[PDB]
Amino acid sequence: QTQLFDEKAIQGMDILFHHYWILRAEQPEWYQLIREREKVLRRYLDEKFGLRLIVHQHFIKLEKIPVEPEGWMGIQDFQEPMDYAIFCCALAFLEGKAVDEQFLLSELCQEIQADYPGDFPLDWTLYTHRKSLIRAVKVLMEFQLIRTIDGDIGRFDQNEEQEVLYEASTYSRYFMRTYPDDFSSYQHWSELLKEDWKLNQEDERRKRVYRKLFFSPGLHRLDQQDPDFLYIRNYRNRLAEDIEKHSEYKLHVYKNTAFLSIAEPRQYQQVFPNSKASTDIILQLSKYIHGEPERFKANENGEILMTEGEFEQVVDDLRQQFGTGWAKYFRDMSTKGIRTELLRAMKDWMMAEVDSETSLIRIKSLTGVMTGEYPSDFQTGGTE
Amino acid sequence: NVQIEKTGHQLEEQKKVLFQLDEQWKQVHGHLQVIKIQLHQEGRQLNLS
Amino acid sequence: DLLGELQFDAEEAAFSEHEVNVHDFERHQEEEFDFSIWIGEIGSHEQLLANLNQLADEENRLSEEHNRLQRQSSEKKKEVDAIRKNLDHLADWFTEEK
Amino acid sequence: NSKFLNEDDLNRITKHFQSRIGKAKELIQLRNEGSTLHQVLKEVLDYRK
């Protein structure tokens, strides 16, 4: 009697990926499902990805360490570095509280203010600082690191005198993974990656390719001799067969990009396209680029190079043609604002890059996978 | 609807004002950061705040 | 006693040369000692403190200006966000009314 | 003929089959099996491929 990767194991793998961790107290069905196949999941993840699956009494967690960090990966509810700083300081504070210990919001604010490591002090009389603290506490509460004894933190936005009674939950201990050395000896985050891959010298390339495929929306060819892409090219067929066998995804490969598509996305997943209006303009831009191959001839690496002025001209052309159907949010905003918003959206999906030095825009081949248009009857309606 | 349009115009105005205030704030912040960097560089050796 | 006073002053001014200069004086201990180098060192230390004092005053001035600007910008952020919440509330109210 | 084949050809073919053995080891281990070296030989000399 031996275990096999089956519907339950596939479901467990998806649940592991699309959440940070699964809590027994809140996700008993998912926790039970994951645990039953936990042997097979551990085997497969170790052999192919190299991720460490942590199975514990209270939670199950997959330490998703990326190959090359990307903007969309981080905690999205946060919008400024200060939010991350306050989040980390709050964690440091919770290390000082015993399980189920109760502390008031004022104590947490005071400790965060004291520890906050910047040259510029953290001050609660401001609006922005209080808003940052509220976002940090909301993300904390999202992971059930701290429970709320009745009160209201949202009022903290407009009433610094607000008070709340919080409770440190057990999960605070396990939130952050362990680090190789005395972690303080390191000087920059890049040094962490050089460690996490020092443990995976064995078949580093296969784990690299699998992590890039499963994590990132796409995998872009670095140059003509990118080793990851060469690996994918050499083993396209067996990679596709294995991925189809072990998960819902199906592999695609092009001259300048490779990615996994999903046919029936469940509720909890994030996918492109989606409801947000900025995607509509992304699809329209993709179609517009398809329509002038000679003007936007892609270079050998699959990138299309445009300067901010040229991009703004393209966006103006789009506002002229399809703007009638855009969401009212964009219809009312100047060209440069639309350019900024669209470029942020396309950055999240690794569709394009903003060149650090020349401010040149690189539209990656992944954008050309999908194109969108209004129904012809509306477009003729737009003519009326 | 009238109130909505009026508030939308007000919101655009306040957005403009906020952007200019943040421009000034970040200019001053950059200057202050440079000055603190220099002070700490020249004041490094001393056991003094 | 003067040596105790001098050590206290070096501690306050963080004059590390005090120890070195004191011992240099002590490795002669009876000669027609030349204080020129010691006086020069304390002069350089005082000049350094003058420069750091000027930088500290400049930093404090810019810090006051920067706090003024930060509070102004945060107040405008509060107003803008209040208006945006009010607009969203009105939009919901208008959909319900329609 | 192998014996009539000079050392240059032997070196070239040795390089070729070393690379092929590496890629076959990679192909089989993707099946999630344990690639016994015999399986790798069976793959590499599979002239159909």
Coordinates of C-alpha atoms in Angstrom, one line a residue:
Chain A
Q1 CA 0.0 0.0 0.0
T2 CA 1.7 3.2 -1.3
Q3 CA 0.6 6.7 -2.0
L4 CA 0.2 8.3 -5.4
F5 CA -0.1 11.9 -6.6
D6 CA -3.9 12.2 -7.3
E7 CA -6.7 14.7 -7.3
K8 CA -6.2 15.3 -3.5
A9 CA -2.5 15.9 -3.9
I10 CA -3.0 18.3 -6.8
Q11 CA -5.6 20.2 -4.8
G12 CA -3.2 20.3 -1.8
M13 CA -0.4 21.7 -4.0
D14 CA -2.6 24.5 -5.3
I15 CA -3.8 25.4 -1.9
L16 CA -0.2 25.5 -0.6
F17 CA 1.0 27.7 -3.4
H18 CA -1.9 30.2 -3.5
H19 CA -1.8 30.9 0.3
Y20 CA 1.1 32.0 2.5
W21 CA 0.2 29.2 5.0
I22 CA -2.8 27.1 6.1
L23 CA -4.0 27.3 9.7
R24 CA -5.6 24.4 11.5
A25 CA -7.9 26.6 13.6
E26 CA -9.4 28.3 10.5
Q27 CA -8.8 26.0 7.5
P28 CA -9.5 22.5 9.0
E29 CA -10.6 21.1 5.7
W30 CA -7.5 22.4 3.8
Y31 CA -5.2 21.4 6.6
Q32 CA -6.6 17.9 6.7
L33 CA -6.4 17.5 2.9
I34 CA -2.8 18.8 2.8
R35 CA -1.6 16.6 5.6
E36 CA -2.9 13.3 4.2
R37 CA -0.8 13.6 1.1
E38 CA 1.9 15.4 3.0
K39 CA 4.4 12.6 2.3
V40 CA 3.9 12.8 -1.5
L41 CA 3.9 16.6 -1.5
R42 CA 7.2 16.7 0.5
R43 CA 8.8 14.2 -1.9
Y44 CA 7.7 16.0 -5.0
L45 CA 8.5 19.5 -3.7
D46 CA 12.0 18.4 -2.6
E47 CA 12.8 16.6 -5.8
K48 CA 11.6 19.2 -8.3
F49 CA 11.4 22.6 -6.5
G50 CA 13.6 22.3 -3.5
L51 CA 11.2 24.3 -1.4
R52 CA 11.0 23.3 2.3
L53 CA 7.5 22.3 3.2
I54 CA 6.9 22.9 6.9
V55 CA 4.2 20.8 8.5
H56 CA 3.4 21.6 12.1
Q57 CA 0.7 21.0 14.7
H58 CA -1.0 24.4 14.1
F59 CA -0.2 25.2 10.5
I60 CA 1.3 24.1 7.2
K61 CA 3.6 26.4 5.3
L62 CA 5.5 26.4 2.0
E63 CA 8.6 28.7 2.2
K64 CA 8.2 30.1 -1.2
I65 CA 11.6 31.6 -1.8
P66 CA 11.7 33.2 -5.2
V67 CA 14.6 32.8 -7.8
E68 CA 14.6 36.6 -8.4
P69 CA 12.3 38.7 -6.3
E70 CA 9.6 40.6 -8.3
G71 CA 7.4 43.5 -7.3
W72 CA 4.1 41.7 -7.1
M73 CA 5.4 39.1 -4.7
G74 CA 5.5 41.3 -1.7
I75 CA 2.7 41.9 0.8
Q76 CA 0.3 43.9 -1.4
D77 CA -1.7 45.7 1.3
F78 CA 1.4 47.8 2.1
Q79 CA 2.2 50.8 -0.1
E80 CA 5.3 52.4 1.4
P81 CA 8.6 51.1 2.9
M82 CA 7.5 52.6 6.2
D83 CA 4.6 50.1 6.3
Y84 CA 7.1 47.3 6.1
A85 CA 9.3 48.8 8.7
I86 CA 6.3 49.2 11.1
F87 CA 5.3 45.6 10.3
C88 CA 8.7 44.2 11.2
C89 CA 8.9 46.3 14.3
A90 CA 5.5 45.1 15.4
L91 CA 6.7 41.5 15.0
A92 CA 9.8 42.3 17.0
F93 CA 7.4 43.6 19.7
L94 CA 5.3 40.5 19.6
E95 CA 8.4 38.4 20.4
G96 CA 8.3 40.1 23.8
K97 CA 4.7 39.0 24.5
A98 CA 3.8 35.5 25.8
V99 CA 1.1 33.5 23.9
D100 CA -2.4 34.9 24.6
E101 CA -0.9 37.8 26.4
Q102 CA -3.0 41.0 26.0
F103 CA -1.6 44.4 25.3
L104 CA -3.1 47.8 24.4
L105 CA -2.7 49.5 21.1
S106 CA -0.9 52.4 22.9
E107 CA 1.8 50.0 24.1
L108 CA 2.3 48.7 20.6
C109 CA 2.5 52.2 19.2
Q110 CA 5.0 53.3 21.8
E111 CA 7.2 50.3 21.3
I112 CA 7.1 50.7 17.5
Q113 CA 8.0 54.4 17.9
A114 CA 10.9 53.5 20.2
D115 CA 12.4 50.8 18.0
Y116 CA 11.7 52.3 14.6
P117 CA 15.2 52.3 13.1
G118 CA 15.1 55.2 10.7
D119 CA 17.0 58.4 11.2
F120 CA 13.7 60.2 11.1
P121 CA 11.6 59.5 14.2
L122 CA 8.2 57.9 13.9
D123 CA 5.5 60.3 15.1
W124 CA 1.9 59.7 15.8
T125 CA 0.6 63.2 15.5
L126 CA 0.7 62.9 11.7
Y127 CA -2.1 61.4 9.6
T128 CA 0.2 59.4 7.3
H129 CA 2.0 57.7 10.1
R130 CA -1.2 56.6 11.8
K131 CA -2.5 55.3 8.4
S132 CA 0.7 53.3 8.0
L133 CA 0.2 51.8 11.4
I134 CA -3.4 50.9 10.6
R135 CA -2.3 49.1 7.4
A136 CA 0.4 47.3 9.3
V137 CA -2.0 46.1 12.0
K138 CA -4.6 45.1 9.3
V139 CA -2.0 42.9 7.6
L140 CA -1.0 41.4 11.0
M141 CA -4.6 40.6 11.8
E142 CA -5.0 39.1 8.3
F143 CA -2.4 36.4 9.3
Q144 CA -4.1 35.9 12.7
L145 CA -0.8 36.9 14.3
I146 CA -2.9 39.0 16.7
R147 CA -6.5 38.7 17.7
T148 CA -8.8 41.6 18.5
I149 CA -10.5 42.0 21.9
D150 CA -13.4 44.3 21.0
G151 CA -12.6 47.8 19.9
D152 CA -12.0 49.6 16.6
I153 CA -8.7 50.3 14.9
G154 CA -10.1 52.0 11.9
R155 CA -11.0 55.0 14.0
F156 CA -7.3 55.4 14.7
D157 CA -7.1 57.2 11.3
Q158 CA -9.0 60.2 12.6
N159 CA -8.6 59.9 16.3
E160 CA -5.1 59.4 17.7
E161 CA -6.7 59.0 21.2
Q162 CA -8.3 55.8 20.0
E163 CA -7.5 52.7 22.1
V164 CA -7.7 49.0 21.5
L165 CA -7.0 45.8 23.4
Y166 CA -5.1 43.2 21.4
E167 CA -4.0 39.6 22.0
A168 CA -0.8 38.0 20.8
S169 CA -1.7 34.7 19.1
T170 CA 0.6 31.7 19.0
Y171 CA 1.3 32.0 15.3
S172 CA 3.5 35.0 15.9
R173 CA 6.3 32.7 16.9
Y174 CA 6.4 30.8 13.6
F175 CA 5.6 33.5 11.1
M176 CA 9.2 34.2 9.8
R177 CA 11.4 31.3 8.6
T178 CA 14.8 30.6 10.0
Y179 CA 18.0 32.1 8.6
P180 CA 21.4 30.3 8.0
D181 CA 24.0 32.1 10.1
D182 CA 23.6 34.5 12.9
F183 CA 21.4 36.6 10.5
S184 CA 22.8 39.9 11.8
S185 CA 26.2 39.1 10.0
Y186 CA 24.5 39.8 6.7
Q187 CA 24.5 43.3 5.1
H188 CA 22.0 43.2 2.2
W189 CA 19.0 41.1 1.3
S190 CA 20.8 39.8 -1.8
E191 CA 23.1 37.9 0.5
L192 CA 20.1 35.8 1.7
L193 CA 19.5 34.4 -1.7
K194 CA 23.1 33.3 -2.2
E195 CA 22.6 31.3 1.0
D196 CA 19.2 29.8 0.2
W197 CA 20.6 28.4 -3.0
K198 CA 23.8 27.2 -1.3
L199 CA 21.6 24.4 0.0
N200 CA 20.4 23.5 -3.5
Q201 CA 23.6 22.9 -5.5
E202 CA 22.2 19.5 -6.6
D203 CA 20.3 20.1 -9.9
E204 CA 20.1 23.8 -9.2
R205 CA 19.0 24.4 -12.8
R206 CA 15.8 22.2 -12.6
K207 CA 14.7 23.8 -9.4
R208 CA 15.4 27.2 -10.8
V209 CA 13.3 26.6 -13.9
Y210 CA 10.4 25.1 -11.9
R211 CA 10.4 27.9 -9.4
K212 CA 10.4 30.5 -12.1
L213 CA 7.6 28.8 -14.0
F214 CA 5.3 28.1 -11.1
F215 CA 5.9 31.5 -9.3
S216 CA 6.2 34.1 -11.9
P217 CA 3.5 34.9 -14.4
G218 CA 6.2 34.3 -17.0
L219 CA 9.8 33.5 -17.6
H220 CA 11.6 35.9 -20.0
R221 CA 14.7 35.0 -22.0
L222 CA 17.6 37.0 -20.6
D223 CA 19.6 36.8 -23.8
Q224 CA 20.4 34.4 -26.7
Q225 CA 22.2 32.0 -24.3
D226 CA 20.0 32.2 -21.1
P227 CA 20.6 28.8 -19.4
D228 CA 17.1 28.5 -17.9
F229 CA 15.5 29.0 -21.3
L230 CA 17.9 26.6 -22.9
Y231 CA 17.0 24.0 -20.3
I232 CA 13.3 24.5 -21.0
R233 CA 13.9 24.2 -24.7
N234 CA 15.8 20.9 -24.3
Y235 CA 13.1 19.3 -22.1
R236 CA 9.9 21.0 -23.4
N237 CA 8.0 17.7 -23.8
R238 CA 8.7 16.0 -20.5
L239 CA 8.3 19.3 -18.6
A240 CA 4.9 19.7 -20.1
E241 CA 3.9 16.1 -19.4
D242 CA 5.1 16.3 -15.8
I243 CA 3.4 19.6 -15.1
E244 CA 0.1 18.4 -16.6
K245 CA 0.4 15.2 -14.5
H246 CA 1.1 17.0 -11.3
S247 CA -1.1 20.2 -11.6
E248 CA -3.8 22.0 -13.5
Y249 CA -1.3 24.1 -15.5
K250 CA -0.2 23.6 -19.1
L251 CA 3.2 24.9 -20.3
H252 CA 3.7 27.2 -23.2
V253 CA 7.0 28.1 -24.9
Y254 CA 8.0 30.8 -27.3
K255 CA 11.2 32.2 -28.8
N256 CA 11.4 34.8 -26.0
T257 CA 9.1 33.7 -23.2
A258 CA 7.7 30.7 -21.4
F259 CA 4.9 30.5 -18.9
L260 CA 2.2 28.3 -17.4
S261 CA -1.5 28.9 -18.3
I262 CA -4.5 27.8 -16.3
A263 CA -7.7 26.8 -17.9
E264 CA -10.2 26.8 -15.0
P265 CA -9.0 29.1 -12.2
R266 CA -10.6 28.5 -8.8
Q267 CA -11.9 31.2 -6.6
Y268 CA -8.8 31.9 -4.5
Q269 CA -6.4 32.3 -7.5
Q270 CA -5.1 35.4 -9.1
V271 CA -5.0 35.5 -12.9
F272 CA -4.8 37.7 -16.0
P273 CA -7.1 38.9 -17.4
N274 CA -9.2 40.0 -14.4
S275 CA -11.8 42.7 -13.4
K276 CA -9.4 45.6 -12.9
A277 CA -9.8 48.2 -15.7
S278 CA -6.1 48.5 -16.3
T279 CA -6.1 45.1 -17.9
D280 CA -8.5 46.2 -20.5
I281 CA -6.1 48.9 -21.7
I282 CA -3.3 46.3 -21.6
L283 CA -5.2 44.0 -23.9
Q284 CA -6.0 46.9 -26.2
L285 CA -2.4 48.0 -26.3
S286 CA -1.4 44.4 -27.1
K287 CA -3.8 44.4 -30.0
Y288 CA -2.5 47.8 -31.2
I289 CA 1.0 46.5 -31.1
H290 CA 0.0 43.5 -33.2
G291 CA -1.5 45.8 -35.7
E292 CA 1.7 47.7 -36.7
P293 CA 4.4 45.0 -36.9
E294 CA 6.8 47.1 -39.0
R295 CA 6.6 50.1 -36.6
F296 CA 6.9 48.0 -33.4
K297 CA 9.2 45.3 -34.8
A298 CA 10.4 43.4 -31.7
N299 CA 14.2 43.1 -31.3
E300 CA 15.8 39.7 -31.2
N301 CA 15.2 39.4 -27.4
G302 CA 11.5 39.8 -27.9
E303 CA 11.4 43.3 -26.3
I304 CA 9.8 46.3 -27.9
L305 CA 11.5 49.5 -27.1
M306 CA 9.7 52.8 -26.7
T307 CA 10.4 56.1 -25.0
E308 CA 8.0 57.7 -22.6
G309 CA 7.0 60.2 -25.3
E310 CA 6.2 57.4 -27.8
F311 CA 4.3 55.4 -25.1
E312 CA 2.3 58.5 -24.3
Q313 CA 1.5 58.9 -28.0
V314 CA 0.3 55.3 -28.1
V315 CA -1.9 55.8 -25.1
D316 CA -3.4 58.9 -26.7
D317 CA -4.2 56.9 -29.8
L318 CA -5.8 54.3 -27.6
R319 CA -7.8 56.9 -25.7
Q320 CA -9.0 58.2 -29.1
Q321 CA -10.1 54.9 -30.4
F322 CA -11.2 52.8 -27.5
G323 CA -11.4 55.5 -24.8
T324 CA -15.1 55.7 -25.2
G325 CA -15.3 52.3 -23.6
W326 CA -12.7 52.7 -21.0
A327 CA -13.7 52.8 -17.3
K328 CA -14.6 56.3 -16.2
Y329 CA -11.6 56.2 -13.9
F330 CA -9.2 56.5 -16.9
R331 CA -11.5 58.5 -19.2
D332 CA -11.1 61.5 -16.9
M333 CA -7.3 61.3 -16.3
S334 CA -4.6 63.0 -18.3
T335 CA -2.2 61.0 -20.6
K336 CA 0.7 60.9 -18.2
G337 CA -1.4 59.6 -15.3
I338 CA -2.7 56.8 -17.5
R339 CA 0.8 56.0 -18.6
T340 CA 1.9 55.7 -15.0
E341 CA -1.0 53.5 -14.0
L342 CA -0.8 51.3 -17.0
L343 CA 2.9 50.9 -16.5
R344 CA 2.4 49.9 -12.8
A345 CA -0.1 47.3 -13.9
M346 CA 2.1 45.9 -16.6
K347 CA 5.0 45.9 -14.1
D348 CA 3.0 43.7 -11.7
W349 CA 2.5 41.1 -14.4
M350 CA 6.1 41.3 -15.6
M351 CA 4.7 42.5 -18.9
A352 CA 7.2 45.3 -19.2
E353 CA 10.2 47.1 -17.6
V354 CA 11.1 50.7 -17.0
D355 CA 14.7 51.0 -17.9
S356 CA 16.5 52.3 -14.8
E357 CA 19.0 54.6 -16.7
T358 CA 17.4 55.9 -19.9
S359 CA 13.7 55.7 -18.8
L360 CA 13.2 53.6 -21.9
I361 CA 10.2 51.3 -21.8
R362 CA 10.7 47.6 -22.6
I363 CA 7.5 45.7 -23.5
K364 CA 8.2 42.0 -23.0
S365 CA 7.0 39.3 -25.3
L366 CA 4.5 38.1 -22.7
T367 CA 2.2 41.0 -23.6
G368 CA 1.6 39.6 -27.0
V369 CA 0.1 36.4 -25.8
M370 CA -3.3 38.0 -25.4
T371 CA -5.3 40.6 -27.3
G372 CA -8.7 42.1 -26.6
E373 CA -11.2 44.3 -28.4
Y374 CA -14.7 45.6 -27.8
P375 CA -17.6 43.7 -29.5
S376 CA -18.0 44.9 -33.0
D377 CA -21.5 46.1 -32.4
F378 CA -20.3 48.6 -29.7
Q379 CA -17.4 49.8 -31.8
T380 CA -19.9 50.6 -34.5
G381 CA -21.9 52.1 -31.6
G382 CA -18.8 54.1 -30.8
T383 CA -18.9 55.4 -34.3
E384 CA -22.5 56.7 -33.9
Chain B
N1 CA -25.2 63.9 -9.2
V2 CA -24.5 67.7 -8.9
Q3 CA -22.8 67.1 -5.5
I4 CA -20.8 64.2 -7.1
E5 CA -19.5 66.4 -9.9
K6 CA -18.7 69.3 -7.5
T7 CA -16.8 66.9 -5.1
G8 CA -15.0 65.5 -8.1
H9 CA -13.7 68.9 -9.1
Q10 CA -12.7 69.6 -5.5
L11 CA -10.9 66.3 -5.4
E12 CA -8.9 67.1 -8.5
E13 CA -7.9 70.5 -7.0
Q14 CA -6.8 69.0 -3.7
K15 CA -4.9 66.3 -5.6
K16 CA -2.9 69.0 -7.4
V17 CA -2.2 70.8 -4.1
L18 CA -1.2 67.6 -2.4
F19 CA 1.2 66.7 -5.2
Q20 CA 2.9 70.1 -5.0
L21 CA 3.2 69.9 -1.2
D22 CA 4.8 66.5 -1.5
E23 CA 7.2 67.8 -4.1
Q24 CA 8.4 70.5 -1.7
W25 CA 8.4 68.0 1.2
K26 CA 10.6 65.6 -0.6
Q27 CA 13.0 68.4 -1.7
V28 CA 13.4 69.4 1.9
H29 CA 13.7 65.8 3.0
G30 CA 16.5 65.1 0.5
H31 CA 18.4 68.2 1.7
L32 CA 18.0 67.1 5.4
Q33 CA 19.1 63.6 4.6
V34 CA 22.2 64.8 2.9
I35 CA 23.0 67.1 5.8
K36 CA 22.5 64.3 8.4
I37 CA 24.8 62.1 6.3
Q38 CA 27.5 64.7 6.3
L39 CA 27.1 65.4 10.0
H40 CA 27.4 61.8 10.9
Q41 CA 30.4 61.4 8.6
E42 CA 32.4 64.2 10.2
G43 CA 31.0 63.5 13.7
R44 CA 31.7 59.7 13.4
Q45 CA 34.8 59.6 15.7
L46 CA 33.2 61.3 18.7
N47 CA 31.4 59.4 21.5
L48 CA 28.7 62.1 21.3
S49 CA 25.1 62.4 20.0
Chain C
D1 CA 44.2 67.7 40.6
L2 CA 44.7 69.5 37.3
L3 CA 45.2 66.2 35.6
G4 CA 41.9 65.0 36.9
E5 CA 40.3 68.2 35.6
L6 CA 42.0 67.6 32.2
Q7 CA 40.8 64.0 32.0
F8 CA 37.3 65.1 32.8
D9 CA 37.4 67.8 30.1
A10 CA 38.8 65.3 27.6
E11 CA 35.9 62.9 28.4
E12 CA 33.4 65.6 27.9
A13 CA 34.9 66.8 24.6
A14 CA 35.7 63.2 23.6
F15 CA 39.4 64.2 23.3
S16 CA 41.1 60.9 22.6
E17 CA 44.5 62.6 22.1
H18 CA 44.4 63.5 25.8
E19 CA 45.5 60.1 26.9
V20 CA 48.2 59.9 24.2
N21 CA 49.4 63.4 24.9
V22 CA 49.3 62.8 28.7
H23 CA 51.4 59.7 28.3
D24 CA 53.8 61.5 25.9
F25 CA 54.2 64.0 28.7
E26 CA 54.8 61.2 31.1
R27 CA 57.5 59.4 29.0
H28 CA 59.5 62.6 29.5
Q29 CA 58.2 63.5 32.9
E30 CA 61.0 65.9 33.8
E31 CA 62.3 67.5 30.6
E32 CA 61.8 71.1 29.4
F33 CA 58.6 69.7 27.9
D34 CA 57.2 71.2 24.7
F35 CA 53.5 71.6 24.8
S36 CA 53.2 73.0 21.3
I37 CA 51.9 69.7 19.9
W38 CA 49.4 69.3 22.7
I39 CA 48.0 72.8 22.3
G40 CA 47.8 72.2 18.6
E41 CA 45.8 69.0 19.1
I42 CA 43.4 70.7 21.5
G43 CA 43.0 73.5 19.0
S44 CA 42.2 71.1 16.2
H45 CA 39.7 69.3 18.4
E46 CA 38.0 72.7 19.2
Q47 CA 37.9 73.5 15.5
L48 CA 36.3 70.2 14.8
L49 CA 33.7 70.8 17.5
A50 CA 33.0 74.3 16.0
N51 CA 32.4 72.7 12.5
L52 CA 30.1 70.0 14.0
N53 CA 28.2 72.7 15.9
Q54 CA 27.6 74.6 12.8
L55 CA 26.4 71.5 11.0
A56 CA 24.2 70.6 14.0
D57 CA 22.5 74.0 13.8
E58 CA 22.0 73.8 10.1
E59 CA 20.5 70.3 10.5
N60 CA 18.2 71.5 13.3
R61 CA 17.0 74.4 11.2
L62 CA 16.2 72.1 8.2
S63 CA 14.6 69.7 10.7
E64 CA 12.2 72.3 11.9
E65 CA 11.4 73.3 8.3
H66 CA 11.0 69.6 7.4
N67 CA 8.6 69.0 10.3
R68 CA 6.5 71.9 9.2
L69 CA 6.3 70.6 5.6
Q70 CA 5.6 67.0 6.8
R71 CA 2.7 68.2 8.9
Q72 CA 1.3 70.3 6.1
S73 CA 1.5 67.4 3.6
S74 CA -0.1 65.0 6.0
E75 CA -2.9 67.4 6.6
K76 CA -3.5 67.7 2.9
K77 CA -3.4 63.9 2.6
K78 CA -6.1 63.7 5.4
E79 CA -8.3 66.2 3.5
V80 CA -7.9 64.5 0.2
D81 CA -8.7 61.1 1.6
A82 CA -11.7 62.4 3.5
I83 CA -13.0 63.9 0.2
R84 CA -12.4 60.6 -1.6
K85 CA -14.3 58.6 1.0
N86 CA -17.1 61.2 0.8
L87 CA -17.2 60.8 -3.0
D88 CA -17.3 57.0 -2.8
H89 CA -20.2 57.3 -0.3
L90 CA -22.0 59.7 -2.6
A91 CA -21.5 57.4 -5.5
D92 CA -23.0 54.5 -3.6
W93 CA -25.9 56.7 -2.5
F94 CA -26.5 57.8 -6.1
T95 CA -26.6 54.2 -7.3
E96 CA -29.1 53.3 -4.6
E97 CA -31.1 56.4 -5.6
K98 CA -31.1 55.5 -9.3
Chain D
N1 CA 35.4 0.9 -37.8
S2 CA 36.2 1.8 -34.2
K3 CA 39.8 0.5 -34.1
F4 CA 40.4 2.1 -37.5
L5 CA 38.8 5.3 -36.1
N6 CA 41.4 7.8 -34.9
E7 CA 41.6 9.3 -31.4
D8 CA 40.0 12.6 -32.5
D9 CA 36.8 10.8 -33.4
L10 CA 36.8 8.9 -30.1
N11 CA 37.2 12.1 -28.2
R12 CA 34.4 13.8 -30.2
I13 CA 32.0 10.8 -29.6
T14 CA 33.0 10.6 -26.0
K15 CA 32.0 14.3 -25.5
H16 CA 28.8 13.7 -27.4
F17 CA 27.8 10.7 -25.3
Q18 CA 28.8 12.4 -22.1
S19 CA 26.4 15.3 -22.9
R20 CA 23.7 12.9 -24.0
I21 CA 24.1 10.9 -20.8
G22 CA 23.7 14.1 -18.8
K23 CA 20.5 15.1 -20.7
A24 CA 19.1 11.6 -20.5
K25 CA 19.7 11.5 -16.8
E26 CA 17.8 14.7 -16.6
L27 CA 15.0 13.4 -18.8
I28 CA 14.4 10.2 -16.8
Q29 CA 14.6 11.8 -13.4
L30 CA 11.8 14.1 -14.5
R31 CA 9.6 10.9 -14.6
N32 CA 10.1 11.0 -10.8
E33 CA 11.7 7.5 -11.0
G34 CA 15.1 6.6 -9.9
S35 CA 17.3 6.7 -13.0
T36 CA 19.3 3.5 -12.8
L37 CA 22.3 3.9 -15.0
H38 CA 21.0 1.0 -17.2
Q39 CA 17.9 3.1 -17.9
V40 CA 20.1 6.0 -18.9
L41 CA 22.0 3.7 -21.3
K42 CA 18.7 2.5 -22.8
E43 CA 17.7 6.1 -23.4
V44 CA 21.0 7.4 -24.8
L45 CA 21.4 4.6 -27.4
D46 CA 17.7 4.9 -28.4
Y47 CA 18.5 5.8 -31.9
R48 CA 14.9 6.5 -32.7
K49 CA 15.2 9.7 -30.7

